[PDB]
Design a protein around this ligand. Sequence first.
Ligand SMILES: Cc1cc2nc3c(=O)[nH]c(=O)nc-3n(C[C@H](O)[C@H](O)[C@H](O)COP(=O)(O)OP(=O)(O)OC[C@H]3O[C@@H](n4cnc5c(N)ncnc54)[C@H](O)[C@@H]3O)c2cc1C
Ligand code: HEM
Length: 383
Amino acid sequence: SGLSTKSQPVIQATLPVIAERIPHITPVFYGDMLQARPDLLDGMFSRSAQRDGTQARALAGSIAIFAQWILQHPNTFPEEMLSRVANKHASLGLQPDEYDTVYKYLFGAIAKDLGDAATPDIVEAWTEVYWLLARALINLERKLYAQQANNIVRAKFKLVKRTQVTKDVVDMVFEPADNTAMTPGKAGQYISIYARTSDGLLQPRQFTLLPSEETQRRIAIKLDPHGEMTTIFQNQEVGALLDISNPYGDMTLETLETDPNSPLVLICAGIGVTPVLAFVEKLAAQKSEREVMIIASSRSLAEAPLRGELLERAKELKKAKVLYGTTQEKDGDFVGRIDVSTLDIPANASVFLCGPLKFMQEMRSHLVEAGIAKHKIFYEIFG
Ligand SMILES: Cc1cc2nc3c(=O)[nH]c(=O)nc-3n(C[C@H](O)[C@H](O)[C@H](O)COP(=O)(O)OP(=O)(O)OC[C@H]3O[C@@H](n4cnc5c(N)ncnc54)[C@H](O)[C@@H]3O)c2cc1C
Ligand code: HEM
């Protein structure tokens, strides 16, 4: 059952008002919920995302995007958004009963904001929208959990190897420290790793899995000088115990391969190399015949994380080319910004982007201007 005929005109008429009030409703929703359920800050919600504010708007904002979608495309869902959210939720171990929690505090905040304007017709219609989306996500998350090799949401790992590989990137290898079986990861997937803040709150962050033994989880963490957890993760000593989630994510090598022989173009900046290296290592293990073009940006070659390993893996591919651009020093294959018009990208190529939001926005724009189909551009936001 999709969006009811009764609710459609109400959602249609109130969508602008609701979208306008979302930034105001969000902090009240979270403030109320996290006062009643402080346990949810100790292992689930990111304190930094609450303090930044804009980030935390995504939950309610996706509800507005969803409402607009089901009005334009009835009995269908924005599957890309649902899949991304479900994989994140599964990484964080979200259980279906908590959708009742979010409903309670979200709609309480709607009531507080709108006051007497929150009449039954409006609350009824938006409640229907909420539960359509919640049910879809719950169903996706249930299927994700069924794929795992274990029945937990995170398990204890020991840090067995730690290497400072650039001025601000630490390459970390973990192995299980309890007897929980590991789910095999797919190239491009990430894990959530957990540590406590200085004042004792458990907090997760996501990192892309890197080539390792099947008995290991390997990640490369770039220091965010204005973030809370990367300093904590990078200061763990060998032997430290941290919890790691099961692996998830829908931005995998299979997602980029639309047909058996389509070429791949992988474009990254900074620590956005991490899915690229995962993809290249897998393609090399598969003895892929695809044409693979890798364009990586860094401030300098010395600051390019994992460049040596990426180049070694790329040498194993039949038809791979790697080009590094340097944006501060002049030692790259090229200097300055990637100019995609110079690239010969055919209409059957898939293009993958991973870098800072601004970098990806400019690349996506210039790709579209150069005639690359939006449907062929795939991206991975780190945050
Ligand atoms: C799928 C996925 C894969 C990822 N893979 C990698 C990877 O391989 N390597 C990697 O290095 N990272 C990766 N990331 C990013 C990573 O998950 C973290 O976002 C990143 O490491 C920053 O974490 P942090 O705790 O240091 O920053 P956070 O504490 O989360 O802060 C992030 C930003 O929030 C703002 N902020 C923080 N505190 C406040 C405050 N008090 N007030 C206002 N604003 C504030 C700042 O602008 C800050 O830069 C990935 C993310 C995702 C979603
Ligand atoms: C219909 C209900 C919900 C919707 C539409 C929704 C939507 C979203 C979206 C869009 C994101 C960002 C995904 C991304 O980063 O790409 C997100 C992240 C997140 N969600 Fe959900 N969500 C819902 C329910 C819940 C519930 C019930 C919980 C827990 C009680 C929860 C906890 C989280 C957490 C912890 C994050 C990580 C970001 C953060 O720490 O703030 N969500 N959600």
